[PDB]
Design a binder for this molecule. Structure first.
Ligand code: SF4
Ligand code: SF4
Ligand code: FES
Lengths: 230, 52
């Protein structure tokens, strides 16, 4: 009742009528690459990394924002999907500078755990690499806005849960930027909690800045006691 | 010389295959700077993933 069997790689599963292709393929234990998407946020689509070749169609669709019709064959690995996940993640790895000796998210960036598995082998660009300038906002958010692959993820968070309407999009085409037009500081509750959301190492912590790389720590779970909600 | 042929009566006569390469006709040095060819489908427009 209230379901459609969709053959994800030729294998049945029953979802709600009106869910997403992403949640369907993640239900059967698979990962499609995720840049312009978050579960705890709204949904946009302006990275165009999830691209699956749907069966009985010459075109390619993106799994972020579309419903699922009567049961398709969501052909995950094809000889054309790998001509797309290689495709998009060759452009955005060009207009970007050669950091990571010094990029402080250097052990967990999503241009670094996608780029071994998916994507191409070498480069053919071979000169270019625009370089914008940075600024300061508060004494907590160490700020390199050069890297900033414009996935529109920090931007919606101002309209999301933290209701401070502060950020925007300034520019057109190749040249757009993310930071505040005026030099207004941005600080309230949750204001230091953006540096987890930024999926590359363009945003990071100010006191933590130059200490140690994230493959030497020992992750032990615990609880903080500085408030009554735990 | 007379100490020479006593080495040539004993255990045959070699005179050229010395146990040292310390003399001449050991390769001393090599001049040119090297450059390596980059061959096996390193190029573009056909060399392309999901084929390899
Ligand atoms: S901080 Fe950088 S990675 Fe995060 S949403 Fe903004 S542009 Fe994208
Ligand atoms: S954030 Fe990603 S692209 Fe930037 S230096 Fe780290 S791994 Fe490289
Ligand atoms: S993954 Fe967000 S749009 Fe493809």
């Amino acid at each position: 009742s209230n379901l459609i069997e969709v053959f994800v790689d030729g294998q049945s599963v029953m979802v709600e009528p009106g869910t997403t292709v992403l949640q369907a393929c993640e239900k059967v234990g698979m990962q499609i690459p995720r840049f312009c998407y978050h579960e705890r946020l709204s949904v946009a689509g302006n990275c165009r990394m999830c691209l699956v070749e749907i069966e009985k169609a010459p075109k390619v669709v993106a799994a972020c924002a579309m419903p699922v019709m009567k049961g398709w064959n969501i052909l995950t690995n094809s000889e054309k999907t790998k001509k797309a996940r290689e495709g998009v993640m060759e452009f955005l790895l060009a207009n970007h500078p050669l950091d990571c000796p010094i990029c402080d998210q250097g052990g967990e960036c999503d241009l670094q755990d996608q780029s071994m598995m998916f994507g191409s082998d070498r480069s053919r660009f071979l000169e270019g690499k625009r370089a914008v300038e940075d600024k300061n906002i508060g004494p907590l958010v160490k700020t390199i806005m050069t890297r900033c692959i414009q996935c529109t993820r920090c931007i919606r968070f101002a309209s999301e849960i933290a209701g401070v309407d502060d950020l925007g999009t300034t520019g057109r085409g190749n040249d757009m930027q993310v930071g505040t037009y005026i030099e207004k500081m941005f600080m309230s509750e949750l204001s230091g909690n953006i540096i987890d959301i930024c999926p590359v190492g363009a945003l990071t912590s100010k006191p933590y800045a130059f200490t140690a790389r994230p493959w030497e720590t020992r992750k032990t779970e615990s609880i903080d006691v500085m408030d009554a909600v735990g | 010389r007379f100490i020479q042929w006593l080495r040539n009566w004993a255990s045959g006569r070699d005179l050229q295959a010395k146990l040292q390469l310390r003399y001449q006709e050991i390769s001393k040095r090599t001049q040119p700077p090297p450059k390596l060819p980059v061959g096996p489908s390193h190029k573009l427009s056909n060399n392309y993933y999901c084929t390899r």
